Swiss-Prot record, chain A:
The chain holds residues 1 to 74 of 513 of the full protein. Produces ATP from ADP in the presence of a proton gradient across the membrane. The alpha chain is a regulatory subunit. It is found in: Cell inner membrane. It comes from Escherichia coli O45:K1 (strain S88 / ExPEC). Belongs to the ATPase alpha/beta chains family. This is ATP synthase subunit alpha.
Swiss-Prot record, chain B:
The keyword Cell inner membrane applies. Keywords: ATP synthesis, Cell inner membrane, Cell membrane, CF(1), Hydrogen ion transport, Ion transport, Membrane, Transport. InterPro entries: ATP_synth_OSCP/delta_N_sf (IPR026015), ATPase_OSCP/d_CS (IPR020781), ATPase_OSCP/dsu (IPR000711). It comes from Escherichia coli O45:K1 (strain S88 / ExPEC). The keyword Transport applies. F(1)F(0) ATP synthase produces ATP from ADP in the presence of a proton or sodium gradient. F-type ATPases consist of two structural domains, F(1) containing the extramembraneous catalytic core and F(0) containing the membrane proton channel, linked together by a central stalk and a peripheral stalk. During catalysis, ATP synthesis in the catalytic domain of F(1) is coupled via a rotary mechanism of the central stalk subunits to proton translocation. This protein is part of the stalk that links CF(0) to CF(1). It either transmits conformational changes from CF(0) to CF(1) or is implicated in proton conduction. Its main location: membrane. Coiled coil: none annotated. GO terms for molecular function: proton-transporting ATP synthase activity, rotational mechanism. One of its GO terms (cellular component) is plasma membrane. It comes from the Bacteria. This is ATP synthase subunit delta. PANTHER family: ATP SYNTHASE DELTA CHAIN. It is a peripheral membrane protein.
Length: 74, 160
């Protein structure tokens, strides 16, 4: 079967089939869930500690901390 | 790596595996699965999404259809569990699981591990020992047993 790495191609194949959706950019993400002006927050991963974060209705958003998994903005 | 969490999952496994007698087959399923899990670009995507259905579908979707209905409803368990992220660990468990029944392996003495299937401790073991005739290989053994006896030794020097 896929033995070694044919899986990857299979993966590729497997991917290629479903492939389209994956990834995103630094500076690019989406705010997933929130309450109280603080947001589960995604994308834009590499940034400087507490850089200003352009908001729609544009404003920067206050950046608390970088969690490993995902982080939210103030 | 809760991995202990494996059991209720992992356990029903062998049983289903027992009952389903798939373990050749189920074993296949597991191979396939850990493979699927491994996918890293996928992995980023993998925790991406909230809707469990979405993942059961998409995961199952690109999967290449190695899936089983029991493994569909059941995969649906792991996703419904939401715990599924870590699943590959179970294979290790499953190994032991598979191993558990009748299996044996080996620890290298000073060289390399035969992993011989020998179920009699110190006997089937001894059978392998004698079976050397593999007596040939050095593979760091001498430094090891001389250094380890030497270690007990300097240990006694300290004791001295």
């Amino acid at each position: 079967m896929q033995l070694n790495s044919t899986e990857i191609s299979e993966l590729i194949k497997q991917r290629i089939a479903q492939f389209n959706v994956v990834s995103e950019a630094h500076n690019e993400g989406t705010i997933v869930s929130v309450s109280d002006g603080v947001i589960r927050i995604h994308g834009l991963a590499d940034a400087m500690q507490g850089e200003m974060i352009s908001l729609p209705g544009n404003r920067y958003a206050i950046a608390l901390n970088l969690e490993r998994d995902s982080v939210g903005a103030v | 790596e809760f991995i202990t969490v494996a059991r209720p999952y992992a356990k029903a496994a062998f049983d289903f595996a027992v009952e389903h007698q798939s373990v050749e087959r189920w074993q296949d399923m597991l191979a396939f699965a850990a493979e699927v899990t491994k996918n890293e670009q996928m992995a980023e995507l993998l925790s991406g999404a909230l809707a469990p259905e979405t993942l059961a579908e998409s995961f199952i979707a690109v999967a290449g259809e190695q899936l089983d209905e029991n493994g569909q409803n059941l995969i649906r368990v792991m996703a419904e569990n939401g715990r599924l992220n870590a699943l590959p660990d179970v294979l290790e468990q499953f190994i032991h699981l598979r191993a558990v029944s009748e299996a044996t392996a080996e620890v290298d003495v000073i060289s390399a591990a035969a992993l011989s299937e020998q179920q009699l401790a110190k006997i089937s073991a001894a059978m392998e020992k004698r079976l050397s005739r593999k007596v040939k290989l050095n593979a760091k053994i001498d430094k090891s047993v001389m250094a380890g006896v030497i270690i007990r030794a300097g240990d006694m020097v300290i004791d001295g």
